[PDB]
Scaffold this active site. Structure first.
Site, PDB file in Angstrom:
ATOM      1  CB  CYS B  65      -0.948   0.033   1.196  1.00  0.00           C
ATOM      2  SG  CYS B  65      -1.912   1.545   1.236  1.00  0.00           S
ATOM      3  NE  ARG B  68       2.344   0.614   3.507  1.00  0.00           N
ATOM      4  CZ  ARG B  68       3.536   0.057   3.686  1.00  0.00           C
ATOM      5  NH1 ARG B  68       3.891  -0.387   4.886  1.00  0.00           N
ATOM      6  NH2 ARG B  68       4.379  -0.045   2.667  1.00  0.00           N
ATOM      7  CD1 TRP B 237      -7.050   8.911  -2.493  1.00  0.00           C
ATOM      8  CD2 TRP B 237      -8.074   9.392  -0.556  1.00  0.00           C
ATOM      9  NE1 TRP B 237      -6.105   9.425  -1.633  1.00  0.00           N
ATOM     10  CE2 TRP B 237      -6.710   9.724  -0.437  1.00  0.00           C
ATOM     11  CE3 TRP B 237      -8.921   9.607   0.538  1.00  0.00           C
ATOM     12  CZ2 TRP B 237      -6.172  10.258   0.735  1.00  0.00           C
ATOM     13  CZ3 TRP B 237      -8.387  10.140   1.700  1.00  0.00           C
ATOM     14  CH2 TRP B 237      -7.023  10.459   1.788  1.00  0.00           C
ATOM     15  CD  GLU B 242      -5.692   1.972  -6.895  1.00  0.00           C
ATOM     16  OE1 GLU B 242      -6.175   0.848  -6.629  1.00  0.00           O
ATOM     17  OE2 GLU B 242      -5.744   2.943  -6.107  1.00  0.00           O
TER      18      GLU B 242
HETATM   19  C1  HEM Z   1      -6.396   6.616   1.455  1.00  0.00           C
HETATM   20  C2  HEM Z   1      -6.150   6.304   0.177  1.00  0.00           C
HETATM   21  C3  HEM Z   1      -5.444   5.074  -0.268  1.00  0.00           C
HETATM   22  C4  HEM Z   1      -4.749   4.958  -1.428  1.00  0.00           C
HETATM   23  C5  HEM Z   1      -4.567   6.050  -2.454  1.00  0.00           C
HETATM   24  C6  HEM Z   1      -4.235   3.632  -1.496  1.00  0.00           C
HETATM   25  C7  HEM Z   1      -3.484   3.183  -2.577  1.00  0.00           C
HETATM   26  C8  HEM Z   1      -3.292   1.829  -2.770  1.00  0.00           C
HETATM   27  C9  HEM Z   1      -2.966   1.257  -4.020  1.00  0.00           C
HETATM   28  C10 HEM Z   1      -2.783   2.024  -5.305  1.00  0.00           C
HETATM   29  C11 HEM Z   1      -2.846  -0.083  -3.853  1.00  0.00           C
HETATM   30  C12 HEM Z   1      -2.517  -1.107  -4.925  1.00  0.00           C
HETATM   31  C13 HEM Z   1      -3.828  -1.755  -5.406  1.00  0.00           C
HETATM   32  C14 HEM Z   1      -3.713  -2.575  -6.675  1.00  0.00           C
HETATM   33  O1  HEM Z   1      -2.804  -2.370  -7.518  1.00  0.00           O
HETATM   34  O2  HEM Z   1      -4.564  -3.470  -6.901  1.00  0.00           O
HETATM   35  C15 HEM Z   1      -3.105  -0.341  -2.486  1.00  0.00           C
HETATM   36  C16 HEM Z   1      -3.042  -1.610  -1.969  1.00  0.00           C
HETATM   37  C17 HEM Z   1      -3.531  -1.851  -0.706  1.00  0.00           C
HETATM   38  N1  HEM Z   1      -4.031  -0.958   0.174  1.00  0.00           N
HETATM   39 FE1  HEM Z   1      -4.110   0.933   0.050  1.00  0.00          FE
HETATM   40  N2  HEM Z   1      -4.616   2.927  -0.424  1.00  0.00           N
HETATM   41  C18 HEM Z   1      -5.333   3.739   0.389  1.00  0.00           C
HETATM   42  C19 HEM Z   1      -5.946   3.439   1.611  1.00  0.00           C
HETATM   43  C20 HEM Z   1      -5.984   2.173   2.189  1.00  0.00           C
HETATM   44  C21 HEM Z   1      -6.753   1.785   3.301  1.00  0.00           C
HETATM   45  C22 HEM Z   1      -7.701   2.689   4.052  1.00  0.00           C
HETATM   46  C23 HEM Z   1      -6.473   0.443   3.562  1.00  0.00           C
HETATM   47  C24 HEM Z   1      -7.047  -0.414   4.630  1.00  0.00           C
HETATM   48  C25 HEM Z   1      -7.319  -0.007   5.872  1.00  0.00           C
HETATM   49  C26 HEM Z   1      -5.525   0.020   2.576  1.00  0.00           C
HETATM   50  C27 HEM Z   1      -4.966  -1.235   2.464  1.00  0.00           C
HETATM   51  C28 HEM Z   1      -4.388  -1.676   1.264  1.00  0.00           C
HETATM   52  C29 HEM Z   1      -4.132  -3.107   1.039  1.00  0.00           C
HETATM   53  C30 HEM Z   1      -4.410  -4.246   1.984  1.00  0.00           C
HETATM   54  C31 HEM Z   1      -3.604  -3.223  -0.186  1.00  0.00           C
HETATM   55  C32 HEM Z   1      -3.167  -4.520  -0.847  1.00  0.00           C
HETATM   56  C33 HEM Z   1      -4.259  -5.143  -1.719  1.00  0.00           C
HETATM   57  C34 HEM Z   1      -3.815  -6.422  -2.402  1.00  0.00           C
HETATM   58  O3  HEM Z   1      -2.799  -7.052  -2.025  1.00  0.00           O
HETATM   59  O4  HEM Z   1      -4.480  -6.873  -3.363  1.00  0.00           O
HETATM   60  N3  HEM Z   1      -5.247   1.102   1.782  1.00  0.00           N
HETATM   61  N4  HEM Z   1      -3.374   0.843  -1.813  1.00  0.00           N
HETATM   62  N1  LIG Z   2      -7.322   2.770  -3.635  1.00  0.00           N
HETATM   63  C1  LIG Z   2      -7.513   1.478  -3.325  1.00  0.00           C
HETATM   64  N2  LIG Z   2      -7.045   0.510  -4.131  1.00  0.00           N
HETATM   65  C2  LIG Z   2      -7.085  -0.800  -3.850  1.00  0.00           C
HETATM   66  C3  LIG Z   2      -6.515  -1.302  -2.677  1.00  0.00           C
HETATM   67  C4  LIG Z   2      -6.528  -2.663  -2.407  1.00  0.00           C
HETATM   68  C5  LIG Z   2      -7.079  -3.539  -3.333  1.00  0.00           C
HETATM   69  C6  LIG Z   2      -7.625  -3.056  -4.515  1.00  0.00           C
HETATM   70  C7  LIG Z   2      -8.192  -3.944  -5.424  1.00  0.00           C
HETATM   71  N3  LIG Z   2      -7.225  -4.508  -6.369  1.00  0.00           N
HETATM   72  C8  LIG Z   2      -8.003  -5.240  -7.383  1.00  0.00           C
HETATM   73  C9  LIG Z   2      -7.108  -5.827  -8.478  1.00  0.00           C
HETATM   74  C10 LIG Z   2      -7.941  -6.387  -9.598  1.00  0.00           C
HETATM   75  C11 LIG Z   2      -6.839  -7.051 -10.397  1.00  0.00           C
HETATM   76  C12 LIG Z   2      -5.942  -7.646  -9.301  1.00  0.00           C
HETATM   77  N4  LIG Z   2      -6.423  -7.051  -8.038  1.00  0.00           N
HETATM   78  C13 LIG Z   2      -7.631  -1.688  -4.769  1.00  0.00           C
HETATM   79  C14 LIG Z   2      -8.165   1.164  -2.192  1.00  0.00           C
HETATM   80  C15 LIG Z   2      -9.210   0.318  -2.068  1.00  0.00           C
HETATM   81  C16 LIG Z   2      -9.624   0.179  -0.799  1.00  0.00           C
HETATM   82  C17 LIG Z   2      -8.945   0.902   0.110  1.00  0.00           C
HETATM   83  S1  LIG Z   2      -7.749   1.761  -0.718  1.00  0.00           S
HETATM   84 CL   LIG Z   3     -10.011  -1.327  -8.433  1.00  0.00          CL
END
Ligand code: HEM
Ligand SMILES: N=C(Nc1cccc(CNC[C@@H]2CCCN2)c1)c1cccs1
Ligand SMILES: [Cl-]
Ligand code: HEM
Ligand SMILES: N=C(Nc1cccc(CNC[C@@H]2CCCN2)c1)c1cccs1
Ligand SMILES: C[C@H](O)[C@H](O)[C@H]1CNc2nc(N)[nH]c(=O)c2N1
Ligand SMILES: C[C@H](O)[C@H](O)[C@H]1CNc2nc(N)[nH]c(=O)c2N1
Ligand SMILES: [Cl-]
Lengths: 362, 362
Positions: B65, B68, B237, B242
């Site tokens: 993420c 963070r 957001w 993405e």
């Molecule tokens: C506040 C704005 C936030 C932004 C801009 C952001 C941005 C991102 C982005 C761009 C990803 C990669 C997602 C992908 O490529 O599929 C990501 C992954 C992640 N974010 Fe954030 N995030 C935010 C907030 C949060 C929040 C609030 C949480 C949970 C409390 C969180 C937990 C995660 C987790 C667990 C992943 C990994 C998802 C996976 O492995 O598929 N994020 N974040």
């Molecule tokens: N901006 C966000 N992006 C995000 C974060 C975690 C997971 C995802 C979903 N990823 C979906 C993709 C779909 C193709 C492989 N996984 C989006 C957030 C989503 C929820 C909190 S932050």
């Molecule tokens: Cl998405």
């Protein structure tokens, strides 16, 4: 221990090499000659066939290289016969000439005598045979910052740069027995350079950018069957992004993105405008266009990734393990538009291979 | 073994949590109550303070993420009190409403009762609370291919999609004790969508693209001190890439790059023209422009990377180990223009954290 390392590395190499060369029946006898040779001399000498195929396998095993499809067509030049600095110089001059090939670049490696007791016979100081100097005085920045320390070293040896942004560094290398390296200015007739222009935007030439045609890495160690070839410069052609997205774009390199934005007529004020992204695309388009226009080989990152896919398929078909470094294989622009981004790679080290080694200056 | 895993995970969590909350003196007594509770019931119940800080730590530990920096301002909603599907539905509806906040998105997590004996109390089928359906019949492709299997599952349960490219999936979840999940259509008044237009190119609207405002992940497991919260949907957001570089761009998703190239008036014929790169930049500019224009929160990848740098600095100053996944942190466009690309990250798993879990369909 060291003789044992040598023998073990030799056994694995010869078995694999002769296997690939359909010479499996000759392994036993060749291994015998080698062990006797190691026993008596502390080392062993590769046949021309082993050396050539070894350098090819080494390329094939380079995890960070996207250009590996063409590993088997590497042109190998055997210069284990050199004894004088004039011979080394002329071998380096020749490498530049034959690799350049009037713009139609031939992937080539020139192989110099290997280390003996870890003792180098020839020690090349250049990072690349053709590269631009760099200067930093009271925060006056000129040229390529990546070359600052080598540039300072050359100016300790009696050389003086003109302090343009594109001073060609001289060749600099040291022979076993000498305390100081020697340096030779590059004949300009050997060095192809490419002025950077844009296909659609005439103002792009106002940046007065250029780059050299042929990247020739001269500071990595080729390792083949336990033999350390510390001096073995090699070249391919560029992938456009190496120049357009890194060499000319990095803040710690030529740092040209704000100037690119200006000449292509976009604002460089807001992150949300993605002006850096736009500037990167146009600069990379310019680089490809310019090399093509001059008849100098280059590959774009999409084509290179397609080729690398074929390399993956080729390996699967030949029953070879594929190794790669995902973090280096993905191009620095639009990586998710390539297949590479969407799979994973085993980053295991397989030999023969090319390795980093300590710099003799700094 | 399982009770022991629970107790060990609990000890580490409470010690760390209370440490951060300046409640270190209360650890001994709280640990005692917990061990007695585990002994007698086979589990333990978090205080509201532990749950809230646990969900925040979990975000702080999410290696992939980039967002963070803002971990400590997460809005945590405690819904461990729900017992009926109506309550779950209304809690999900409320989450969408309060997180959306008329466009000024509030990062929010709603936490449902945790697993007991590995037995789920509430089982959410959606990948995100708001997502588009996908269809594949005889190679007729409609909507989001990523949603094909969930879409097929919903249509087994009596739902029917309209088969536009942007059908909103219903909420679908199963209560402990029921064999089949239930589904509820989303009230449209709760769902903000953004039409994609370009700031300079009027023709871009001909693509009739749109996306939803708020990504709410509803299929990951929140783990806090050995307690498994399998149902705990959370949102932030979007980062523009993405949507612009993946969701709308991937060949296995909406696959819009050739159509983007057409409307922005460039050829999509030659790799060397970098038309995909150019198309990617313009589509990503459009996405940022459109979200901004509608007053819906979004962040560009440069700003997000700057924020993440501050997160790195914050961790260093607080004496916390930083963990990250380089391969996910780098944005899919111009990654080398961010600092992330030029350093490395320890990808160790630290708990509390969010984890993948098996899908209840497929
Ligand atoms: C506040 C704005 C936030 C932004 C801009 C952001 C941005 C991102 C982005 C761009 C990803 C990669 C997602 C992908 O490529 O599929 C990501 C992954 C992640 N974010 Fe954030 N995030 C935010 C907030 C949060 C929040 C609030 C949480 C949970 C409390 C969180 C937990 C995660 C987790 C667990 C992943 C990994 C998802 C996976 O492995 O598929 N994020 N974040
Ligand atoms: N901006 C966000 N992006 C995000 C974060 C975690 C997971 C995802 C979903 N990823 C979906 C993709 C779909 C193709 C492989 N996984 C989006 C957030 C989503 C929820 C909190 S932050
Ligand atoms: Cl998405
Ligand atoms: C034929 C055209 C070739 C292309 C387009 C190509 C492309 C590339 C690129 C883009 C890199 C990454 C460089 C960087 O980011 O700094 C690379 C790395 C590498 N290539 Fe190739 N390559 C080619 C030929 C060769 C040849 C002929 C060899 C040697 C025989 C070779 C060995 C390597 C090695 C060792 C690296 C890693 C360098 C490092 O770790 O710093 N490549 N290649
Ligand atoms: N196209 C090439 N690129 C390439 C390959 C290996 C090494 C390099 C040099 N990389 C230099 C950068 C400078 C910053 C960090 N290392 C370039 C080739 C060079 C030589 C053979 S292929
Ligand atoms: C194979 C590779 O790990 C995979 O494609 C990853 C690469 N990095 C990523 N990074 C982000 N942010 N999101 C992703 O979906 C992926 N995909
Ligand atoms: C820290 C990171 O490993 C480093 O910046 C790498 C990333 N990937 C790369 N990939 C290539 N091709 N070339 C590079 O110089 C780098 N730099
Ligand atoms: Cl280079």
């Amino acid at each position: 221990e060291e003789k044992e390392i040598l023998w073990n590395e030799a056994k694995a190499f010869i078995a694999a090499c002769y296997q690939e060369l359909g010479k499996a029946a000759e392994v036993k006898d060749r291994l015998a000659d080698i062990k006797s040779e190691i026993d008596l001399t502390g080392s062993y000498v590769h046949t021309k066939e082993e050396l050539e195929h070894g350098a090819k396998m080494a390329w094939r095993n380079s995890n960070r290289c996207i250009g590996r499809l063409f590993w088997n067509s590497l042109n190998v030049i055997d210069r284990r016969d050199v004894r004088t600095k004039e011979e080394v110089r002329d071998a380096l001059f020749h490498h530049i000439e034959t690799a350049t090939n009037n713009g139609k670049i031939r992937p080539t490696i020139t192989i110099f005598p290997p280390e003996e007791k870890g003792e180098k016979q020839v020690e090349i100081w250049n990072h690349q045979l053709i590269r631009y100097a760099g200067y930093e005085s009271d925060g006056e920045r000129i040229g390529d910052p990546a070359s600052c320390s080598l540039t300072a070293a050359c100016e300790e040896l009696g050389w003086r740069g003109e302090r343009t942004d594109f001073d060609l560094l001289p060749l600099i290398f040291r022979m076993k027995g000498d305390e100081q390296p020697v340096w030779y200015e590059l004949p300009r007739s050997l060095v192809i350079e490419v002025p950077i222009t844009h296909p659609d935007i005439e103002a792009f030439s106002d940046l007065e950018l250029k780059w050299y045609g042929v990247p020739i890495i001269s500071d990595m160690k080729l390792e083949v069957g336990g033999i350390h070839y510390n001096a073995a410069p090699f070249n391919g052609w560029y992938m456009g992004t190496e120049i357009g997205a890194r060499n000319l774009a990095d803040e710690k390199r030529y740092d040209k993105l704000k100037k690119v934005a200006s000449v292509i007529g976009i604002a460089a004020d807001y992150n949300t405008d993605l002006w850096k992204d736009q500037a990167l695309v146009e600069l990379n388009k310019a680089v490809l266009h310019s090399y093509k226009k001059q008849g100098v080989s280059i590959v774009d990152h999409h084509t290179a990734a397609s080729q690398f896919k074929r390399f993956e398929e080729q390996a699967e078909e030949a029953g070879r393990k594929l190794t790669g470094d995902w973090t280096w294989l993905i191009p620095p622009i639009s990586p998710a538009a390539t297949h590479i981004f969407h799979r994973s790679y085993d980053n295991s080290i397989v030999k023969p291979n090319y390795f980093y080694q300590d710099k003799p200056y700094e």
